[PDB]
């Protein structure tokens with residue numbers, strides 16, 4: 260089993276106990292640690308924060324403590340958008356520039372691989388031609404990594420990709436069968452199924468559908484996303500089930516209608532540490548004062564409300580349920596977004612450090 264965990268290079272800017280610093284990294288919590296995010300300049304891999312080089316040395320320095328650990332560098336993410344990917348994959352020449360830059364960069368900073376997080380080929384402004392060009396990029400990287408291993412005698416760089424759960428994005432961007440041949444593993448982003456971009460409440464990461472759902476909505480759940488990627492050609496051993504350590508929040512139209520599917524007027528109030536309306540870290544809801552928590556019966560996940568604020572999130576119980584699920588489906592492991600949104604310092608939830616991610620590690624039988 261794998262436990263793939265994302266580190267984010269902006270968590271260092273949160274205040275107080277929420278500030279995530281190198282001392283908060285645990286070399287043996289996860290099997291694979293992915294650094295979010297690198298960017299791109301002139302079609303070439305590049306840093307995005309002023310101290311990335313300092314953090315790269317910390318990050319890969321964990322491997323001194325746990326020599327089994329593998330690290331990857333992720334390029335892209337939601338905010339990065341698509342234009343730079345589109346421009347880089349538009350020609351073989353530009354892809355070659357990128358691939359060669361990536362190998363040099365990963366070796367320079369001692370990363371064990373690259374995680375592609377383009378959100379997404381064929382969507383978010385990216386043209387339809389990018390579906391096949393993404394296939395080619397994946398093939399180009401895999402083949403070049405194989406070649407460099409032969410030339411250098413070093414262990415081959417890994418290639419993974421973070422991929423969407425929703426059929427609209429999957430079919431617009433991903434030749435699933437083809438890319439599965441070349442990716443070492445596939446990080447399924449089985450979250451953001453619902454959120455405050457919708458005008459009714461819905462859970463960030465439900466395992467199964469609700470009875471009231473039909474049509475496309477009935478596939479906006481973890482089980483459907485997993486089965487989608489498997490049936491479209493991803494080997495189970497390569498499919499890594501993503502898990503969120505955050506929830507998605509809504510302001511209710513009325514505090515007297517708190518159902519799943521109740522009318523919402525927008526994002527929930529920003530969290531005191533995360534300061535982003537529409538999401539909250541686990542540590543911002545795990546002990547939410549004066550709130551009312553219950554479970555969504557068929558979806559196997561909790562929601563919590565307080566006055567006109569409503570939040571769908573994951574807890575220890577839902578993480579256990581999801582690991583039981585992934586094991587039943589024979590998947591390659593779990594992935595988690597993100598280290599810094601769990602109660603990494605044990606300051607809020609009275610459940611110790613990393614209560615959610617330690618649950619994943621325990622349920623996968625990966626405890627040192």
Ligand SMILES: CC(=O)N[C@@H]1[C@@H](O)[C@H](O[C@@H]2O[C@H](CO)[C@@H](O)[C@H](O)[C@H]2NC(C)=O)[C@@H](CO)O[C@H]1O
Nearest residue numbers: 336337338339376378421448451505535538596
């Ligand atoms: C692998 C993965 O989940 N990638 C995406 C993430 O970028 C995204 O997290 C969001 O990243 C933004 C930067 O690109 C941040 O500004 C934003 O705060 C952050 N949101 C959260 C809830 O952490 C995650 C989660 O939505 O999903 C992908 O879209």
